[PDB]
Subunit: 309 residues, 3 copies
């Protein structure tokens, strides 16, 4: 089969609300491990990463906690390279999407040929100089794209970073709130994306066929799914830091993941931006967490038509 | 036109919660008859079947109320054969889906060439030996399929049963919670099914075109729609005994039924698993019942584009 | 670019509930102007039309307030012809859809070649003689269609009306509650329509491609989008006078409008039937209004993939 390599990443300094740290904990408490075990893959829990805080982490321009966000990805990258070394799918239950920098970097150190599918309401492709909020959870892709090196200033904390993925190797699914600058980068660099407009016109079925043919056409290769829980509509994942109406349906989230599983090329997965302290009610938290687990489970074989040994 | 042959079937011993008996009553009280009359078909109410209880109905292995569930279908089968004899569409407003055994049997005694469309979140294809719950409302198809005879043990109450439908003659629409054994039967026997995954990939439009071409391709023939209210999402039919998230939308339920009506081959209909005592609030009950009536009405001509004489 | 010509039309006598008058006000207070200004079009606010009441406006048969509804459209028509004269897109934030009579008339006096896309749960094609409610907000299309002249009796208030649009030049999107007589007109006249049934079968993507090819096939030409807020499901626009379940999703409303914008042929827009006094709660009002603004904004360039100068 395909072994699972779990990695906790309770980090929240890539953004303002500290609750996303709760992510790994709640995800675990929801029985994620035994459910993956109920399925058919070996679960190797590498535990939760201990991110020692950086006492004097002054901002870079408008960018906050640059050193914390940077060392957090650095640790994670080395962590992801090890699970991928022990021949496994890296499964990061993170806090804020700024961790994708480390997740994808450590992943690419083992399989530099990987292609990325980014399910998000946002592009998270802002740079230190285009950012207006200064939150690093909305800039991970800029530090990763090869075509943007030269546009990324040397920020404290990211000297280790080497642009690992090119414009032609990533696909966005679910966009609906892209910054004017981010949109400029999408269109200028020619990044493949399926915003809600496209999902509406093609239907999720044609969307998945097209993103997979676009990435797996010429050559088969490792697939890194970075999944931001806010890619789905707030009625399904309300306990997230930046929710936007008109998102992917419960069902569309499962299709995406069931189709990615079937390629048999999943190599790394990120389950990001879940923040239970942001659910209106205790059920809003339970709804967001269960949808996140259901999502993760489809990535590893859980199919709605059924399964059997 | 096409005459309607209504049949009440207030039976609940095919499962654990006794409220599904309420089905016929609430469905009637919702004005189902006068609304069908407002449309263009003759309504002949054969009343509600009186299912005398079996005093000493001991279990078969783990299967409960086998004799009650069996005689309930037996009566219903003979009842369905009569309405189909008086040249009409049999319309069973049942309790639990175990009644499908009788509905489809009595139907096939008149038109053994019928093809079946099973709208459900479940396959209900468990046998007495594969069942874990032992509830007969999740085993009707096994007693019906010809390819499973030889696998079905002789259960008290079903000596009258003769496998009437073959694997190649039934289509599932809406699956999302199939047991590991049920999935084995689907795949082994090669039963046509459109789980939520397929509905997501093809869209309900291609799904209906494909299930109808699959059943009505070679030859036109009587169509039996067995509709489990839980085939639709709990946000539309919450007052049911086994609800599952990610189901058919209000709109998708109507399309299915509007397309089935248009074939002009509807011959039998089952409106199952509605249980008002299971609605959280009085409106949860009203929502589930009205959606059930709206569904039944589309089966008989009610179209969203409009109608006229 | 394409200049915007805003027109307030706080009129409610085309129907029974007086709250729709609130429309222009709430729509404005929601920041509609500055948001359109944030985009890329010149906003010229022609203010809100003052509809002096007609003291002795007795009914025509069963038709109520004929003289008020008629003079309201008459003023509006002359108003719409002026904005269209100052080279702009007429944007009417009305009350009840009876105003479409004036909106489309004054529009056609400037561009008689316009084609119409009518997003509604209803056809609003009843005549004075087929109407049963006698509310003029459900009869605007009959006074407009050229093929129905001869069927429209001379009603007090509409002597100025000259059938401006032919059957072949209008497309309906979202129908789900058409009167038996209205359906007769649709089918008899051969009006192009995509009811919810079609939206379900084709998907909104094929629907928009087909309605645009149907109208913009032979020749490009001015497009008048008359948008009834009730065309969308009540879960998105609950504060409307005649809501019907099974409507267009939040996302489908945006696709329609994003695709219409892209043709670059939008010439007139009506944002009708919003009635805040009909929202159950203050958020039901806010939900209906924001969805209406989001809709209007997509008509003028707001795209979910993003925008930039
Ligand atoms: N465009 C916004 C996006 S914040 C959302 C971040 B994330 O996708 O990770 O939740 C920015 O620059 O902060
Ligand atoms: N697979 C379950 C299904 S229970 C649902 C039954 B019915 O579809 O009729 O609601 C079982 O064997 O009890
Ligand atoms: N068919 C109904 C429709 S009322 C709905 C009007 B409107 O679409 O404008 O909201 C009638 O004749 O009053
Ligand atoms: Mn993100
Ligand atoms: Mn996001
Ligand atoms: Mn069932
Ligand atoms: Mn079921
Ligand atoms: Mn209208
Ligand atoms: Mn309407």
């Amino acid at each position: 089969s395909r072994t699972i390599g779990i990695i906790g990443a309770p980090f929240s300094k890539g953004q303002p609300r500290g609750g996303v740290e709760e992510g790994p904990t709640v995800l675990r408490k929801a029985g994620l491990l035994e459910k993956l075990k109920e399925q058919e893959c070996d679960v190797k829990d590498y535990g939760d990463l201990p991110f020692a805080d950086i006492p004097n982490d002054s901002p870079f321009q408008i960018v906050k906690n640059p050193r914390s966000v940077g060392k957090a990805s650095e640790q994670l990258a080395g962590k992801v390279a090890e699970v991928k070394k022990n021949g496994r799918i890296s499964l990061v239950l993170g806090g804020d999407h700024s961790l994708a920098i480390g997740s994808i970097s450590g992943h690419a150190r083992v399989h530099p040929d990987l292609g990325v599918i980014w399910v998000d309401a946002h592009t998270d492709i802002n740079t230190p100089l285009t950012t207006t909020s200064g939150n690093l959870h909305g800039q991970p892709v800029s530090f990763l794209l090869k075509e943007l090196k030269g546009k990324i200033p040397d920020v404290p904390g990211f000297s280790w970073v080497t642009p690992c993925i090119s414009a032609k190797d990533i696909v966005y699914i679910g966009l609906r709130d892209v910054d004017p600058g981010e949109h400029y980068i999408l269109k200028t660099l020619g990044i493949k994306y399926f915003s809600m407009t496209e999902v509406d016109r093609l239907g999720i079925g044609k969307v998945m066929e097209e993103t997979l043919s676009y990435l797996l056409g010429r050559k088969k290769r490792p697939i890194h799914l970075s999944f931001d829980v806010d890619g789905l509509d707030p009625s399904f994942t309300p306990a997230t830091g930046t929710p936007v109406v008109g998102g992917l349906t419960y069902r569309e989230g499962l299709y995406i993941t069931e189709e990615i599983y079937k390629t048999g090329l999943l190599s790394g997965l990120d389950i990001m931006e879940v923040n239970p302290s942001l659910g209106k009610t205790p059920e809003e938290v339970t709804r967001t967490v269960n949808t996140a687990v259901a999502i993760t489970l489809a990535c590893f074989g859980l199919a709605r038509e059924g399964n059997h040994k």
